[PDB]
Amino acid sequence: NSRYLANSKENFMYKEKMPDSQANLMDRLRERERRSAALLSQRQKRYQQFLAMKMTQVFDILFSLTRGQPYTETYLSSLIVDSLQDSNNPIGTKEASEILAGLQGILPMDISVHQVDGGLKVYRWNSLDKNRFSKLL
Amino acid sequence: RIPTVAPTTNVGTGQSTFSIDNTIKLWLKKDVKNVWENLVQLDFFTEKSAVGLRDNATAAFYASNYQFQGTMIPFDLRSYQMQIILQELRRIIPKSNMYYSWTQL
Numbered sequence: 045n046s047r048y049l050a051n052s053k054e055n056f057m058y059k060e061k062m063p064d065s066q067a068n069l070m071d072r073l074r075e076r077e078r079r080s081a082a083l084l085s086q087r088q089k090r091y092q093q094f095l096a097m098k099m100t101q102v103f104d105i106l107f108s109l110t111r112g113q114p115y116t117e118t119y120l121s122s123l124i125v126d127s128l129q130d131s132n133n134p135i136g137t138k139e140a141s142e143i144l145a146g147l148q149g150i151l152p153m154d155i156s157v158h159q160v161d162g163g164l165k166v167y168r169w170n171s172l173d174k175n176r177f178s179k180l181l
Numbered sequence: 182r183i184p185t186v187a188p189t190t191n192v193g194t195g196q197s198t199f200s201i202d203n204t205i206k207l208w209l210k211k212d213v214k215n216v217w218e219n220l221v222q223l224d225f226f227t228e229k230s231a232v233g234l235r236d237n238a239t240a241a242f243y244a245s246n247y248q249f250q251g252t253m254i255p256f257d258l259r260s261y262q263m264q265i266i267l268q269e270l271r272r273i274i275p276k277s278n279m280y281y282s283w284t285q286l
Contacts, residue, residue: 057188057198 091142096181098135099143101128103151103174113168117144117157120166150177214256226261 105127106120124140135143144166148155151174156167187200208216220226228251235241251259271284 057191 093181095139095142095146098139099147099150100175100178102143102147107169107171111169114165116165117141117163120144150180221261225264227264229260229262 102124105124106115110120110123121137121140121144124143125135125137129135144157144164148157148166151172154167154170154172157164159165183202183204185202187202188198189200191198232244235244267284267286274281274284
């Protein structure tokens with residue numbers, strides 16, 4: 045059905061009693077570790093996915109309102125969090141830092157970030173068009 | 182402190198998925214009295230104030246003629262005092278025992 049993430053059946057009981065297999069389970073487990081390599085990395089790519097969608101709005105978050113050129117990192121981050129990210133879809137601080145790093149990396153043309161003593165100050169905005177590079181997920 | 186799972190449903194017309202929850206045979210008043218006598222004669226307990234053995238057969242005989250009244254008080258009121266105090270008790274009962282966590286208050 046539509047992604048109503050309910051599970052009203054899986055909590056029924058200890059129904060998991062049919063498979064009366066032999067030590068064959070070790071067999072399954074012999075492959076488990078294998079997928080543990082992918083699974084972990086898979087989860088990792090999920091952030092490469094997740095963070096992705098977030099930044100799809102961030103180049104219109106700082107852009108559409110903030111034209112102060114010397115903006116730093118801590119201030120801009122603490123702006124990103126507590127911005128619309130106090131709505132249905134929250135986010136964490138260091139995650140905002142990752143979003144910034146990703147934006148810079150996927151657009152080093154304008155966004156130039158270079159760190160002095162603590163906190164990476166960020167560039168002087170010059171308002172490109174973005175999704176043309178956002179397709180590079 | 183036991184998860185105390187007592188589901189009721191099962192496979193259709195299963196009558197399975199029993200609801201055992203207490204899982205410790207709390208003994209009744211009617212049976213414990215046995216253990217109580219066993220203890221009191223293993224000397225872990227004692228009467229409130231009882232002169233154990235008189236000095237000689239003279240005072241002992243003069244105390245046996247005493248029609249005692251603790252006789253009259255029933256079994257379950259004789260105020261027994263202790264012989265092994267809880268602190269020591271914590272030092273001896275091997276912690277493997279599933280009641281060890283009650284020696285200490």
